[PDB]
Ligand binder design. Structure first.
Ligand code: 6EU
Ligand code: XJ7
Lengths: 537, 80, 79, 67, 80
């Protein structure tokens, strides 16, 4: 075999398999070729910065990834040296992990990778009934299902989660089972082991806490069993708790608002508590407001520690947590200034108050139309308002500088006032004759008319047109993102749960088949879905 | 959504104002509302400290409601 | 005609430079009109910052659409 | 705007190419590293016995059919 | 602006003796589904006068497909 680090471990058998030459594969196996030889050179790894082809480093995984079923069957079922179907590479990946890796959610790729996946699963069952390949974890601790969920390989999940195998002695491999079928109507059962809950890598957890770089993190939840499961979890357990939380937050903001509104106007905090009812309630509301701010502060820190965003995931995603945390930061700064005998504690407080009210929109999730509306607002702010505001600020600043240069020894005669006065045009309040302290009236009026045409006429209507184009395209994206926000809310609720409640675990310990490879019966927590079809009678 | 934004910024601004002509949720609410109809004064008072905070709040309100939310409403009505 | 229908950006940069030079000539010509040219150049300069939005996929498309709008829709509407 | 999306993408790429060409043509430093892609041998078999080095540019591609 | 002809030329590959040298696209290695092609690039990047990039980029704006021609695979990747 090769000894260089670039092609390390490549041997003749890899070549014969790779070239799709059955005869040489047979001859090499006959001559005692090692079917476990690991091709672990740099060329046979992921290695994004260099060319290569990762296939799990083993001959069996190679034949599998290359859509050579005959070679797979031979490698497992040859006379001279059968292959170890459970074999793992340096990463710990089995064949199935490799099949997940090579998937890219394209049609032909998904078709053949799914077919090969099914075939290898059947062969694994028939050769080794006690062996459970899918349960095997790599060095990352991921089962092939968990790997597929994390990597965004939607097609593989679309196969696995509703996998149904119609033959004797392979029924127990199915994850979808049909209990009864009367007429066009039949009741299916989806397994959902390690979807709802498990030790570490529940599929819902893996999707929801994805790193924002997974391609299809929005699309994956559309696969029927997950979507129905989330809807059931919502309706049964989480809707009420979420509404209660929203109510509590409304109470919090009302208390904060009342406490801030009735602040005293004297100088130099802290202020002596007067022995009267109004002030006792005031200081009470102040204390509760500060307490809630601290609560959100520590929730934000807990989020940061639990997820550990890497300084880009900290900003490109998870905006809600950042906004709530920033509000709490402003509250704490308000406290520090208050007890430091600085009147600037007002300045912080209002900012927190303002953000608090806007953060109320966080609870629009859980309501179908309103959460979508909130998501579209988020996307609009991130794309269209950012681009527009940059360009508009360029225009505003350029013309402000020109005009304030033209103005000399007037009331305005300064960048701040001129910028404000030009900005008044955008809100339909520009005076257009706001000063005469200049020479060259024609130049001044030309500048203002140019600014007005470029900003008020052209740019704003352009912004409207672009927003109209944007909403035309982000409808289904908005639907997926709202469903995802609902999902993460559900998972947080069930994970916190504050009561040691087990009722969150749904779907009932039902028996699917009753016939394992041994005589034992299998209870698999299946979730029931009824469906009607007027074809295939 | 607009009423949440309006109320929130009205509360912030009226808190910031002290012993002024407005100094009251109703007048401030109307005054911020006037921006939506293209009549926002934007300098309707000086009875505060921290001018920068005041103007920053008004600018944020204008951008969020007048610039973003209304044009978003137009776009959504176009889709509908 | 190719002098105008394309190379919009080069024309604008050139005009900025022209206004700067005219401002200089009027400055040393002992004329106070140099202010009038100068500010135009200044205004033009800041606007031409949008030239550099190109090389960004998101902003450059926006700037391109500004150019197309000015040529077609704004001109028709203003007439 | 509904009718000039794709036109806009092509214009974006186009004038970015303009920027590239002006940069390499001006270059202000007599730099030869701008001439990229390496002097590779394509065939090595011209009509005569000589070998041809033609400054090729590498592009790696992946296809799931025509094995 | 004859974009079709460029689409033919810039990725021209001829598999026979005494005609491979005419090819501008050559296949170096192909392991499984992956393979590395080599595009010739003579008179694209640079030449005496009429480098293809110079001709396209400095087109007269009346060339039909001046927006489209740079979508041709080797040119777009080279520019990137
Ligand atoms: C089309 C021509 C060359 C033009 C050149 C000048 C005089 C200009 O006035 C116009 C006429 C005009 C006047 C008032 C309102 C609209 C248009 O529009 C532009 C031109 C109009 C603009 C347009 O700004 C832009 O094009 C941004 C831009 C987009 C794409 C680009 O590739 C670009 O390269 C710099 C710049 C800005 C001005 O130069 C400017 O800032 C001043 C003070 C007047 C504008 O003449
Ligand atoms: C002075 C006053 C200033 C107020 C400034 C702020 C006003 C807007 C406040 C509106 C409240 C909206 C909200 O509450 O949240 C919005 C955040 O709005 C912004 O964009 C802030 C722009 C900065 C979405 O936050 P979200 O947590 O859902 O992020 C999503 C992920 O969770 C999800 O899983 C997906 O990964 C998705 O890709 C992510 O987006």
């Amino acid at each position: 075999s090769y000894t260089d680090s670039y092609y390390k471990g490549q041997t003749a058998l890899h070549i014969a398999i790779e070239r799709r030459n059955m005869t040489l594969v047979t001859l090499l196996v006959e001559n005692g070729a090692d079917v476990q030889a690991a091709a672990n050179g740099d060329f046979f790894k992921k290695t994004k910065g260099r060319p290569g082809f990762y296939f799990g480093e083993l001959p069996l995984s190679l034949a599998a990834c290359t859509n050579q079923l005959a070679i797979v069957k031979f490698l497992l079922q040859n006379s001279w040296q059968p292959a170890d179907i459970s074999a793992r590479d340096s990463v710990g990946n089995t064949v199935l992990h490799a099949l997940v890796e090579v998937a890219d959610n394209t049609v032909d790729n998904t078709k053949f990778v799914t077919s090969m996946y099914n075939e290898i699963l059947i062969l694994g069952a028939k050769l080794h009934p006690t062996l459970k390949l899918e349960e095997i974890t790599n060095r990352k601790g991921l089962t092939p299902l968990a790997l597929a969920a994390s990597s965004g390989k939607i097609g593989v999940l679309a196969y696995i989660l509703q996998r149904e195998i119609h033959e004797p002695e392979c029924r127990h491999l199915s994850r979808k089972f049909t209990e009864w079928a009367y007429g066009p109507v039949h009741s299916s059962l989806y397994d959902l082991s390690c979807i709802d809950t498990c030790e570490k890598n529940s599929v819902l957890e893996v999707i929801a806490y994805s790193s924002s770089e997974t391609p299809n993190r929005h699309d994956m939840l559309l696969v029927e069993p997950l979507n129905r499961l989330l809807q059931d979890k919502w309706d049964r357990f989480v809707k009420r708790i979420f509404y209660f939380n929203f109510f509590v937050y409304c109470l919090y903001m009302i208390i904060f608002t009342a406490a801030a509104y009735y602040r005293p106007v004297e100088g130099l905090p802290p202020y002596k508590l007067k022995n009267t009812v109004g002030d006792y309630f005031r200081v009470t509301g102040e204390i509760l407001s500060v307490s809630g701010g601290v609560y959100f502060f520590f929730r934000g820190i807990q989020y940061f520690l639990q997820r550990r965003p890497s300084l880009k995931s900290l900003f490109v995603d998870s905006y809600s947590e950042i906004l709530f945390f920033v509000q709490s930061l402003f509250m704490l700064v308000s406290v520090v200034l208050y007890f430091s005998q600085r009147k600037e504690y007002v300045a912080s407080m209002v900012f927190s108050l303002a953000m608090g009210w806007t953060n109320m929109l966080y609870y629009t999730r859980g309501f179908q139309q309103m959460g979508i509306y909130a998501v579209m607002i988020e996307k609009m702010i991130l794309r269209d308002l950012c681009r527009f505001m940059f360009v508009y600020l360029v225009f505003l600043f350029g013309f402000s500088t020109a005009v304030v240069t033209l103005i000399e020894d007037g009331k305005y005669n300064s960048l701040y006032s001129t910028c404000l006065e030009l900005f008044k045009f955008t809100i339909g309040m520009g005076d257009l004759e706001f000063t005469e302290n200049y020479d060259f009236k024609a130049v001044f009026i030309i500048l203002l008319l140019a600014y007005v045409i470029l900003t008020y006429i052209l740019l704003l209507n352009m912004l409207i047109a672009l927003m109209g184009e944007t909403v035309n395209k982000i409808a289904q994206e908005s639907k997926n993102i709202w469903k995802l926000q609902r999902a993460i809310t559900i998972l947080d609720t069930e994970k916190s749960f504050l009561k040691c409640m087990r009722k969150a675990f749904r779907s009932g310990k039902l028996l699917q088949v009753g016939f394992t490879p041994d005589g034992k019966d299998d209870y698999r927590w299946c979730f029931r879905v009824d469906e009607v079809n007027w074809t295939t009678w």
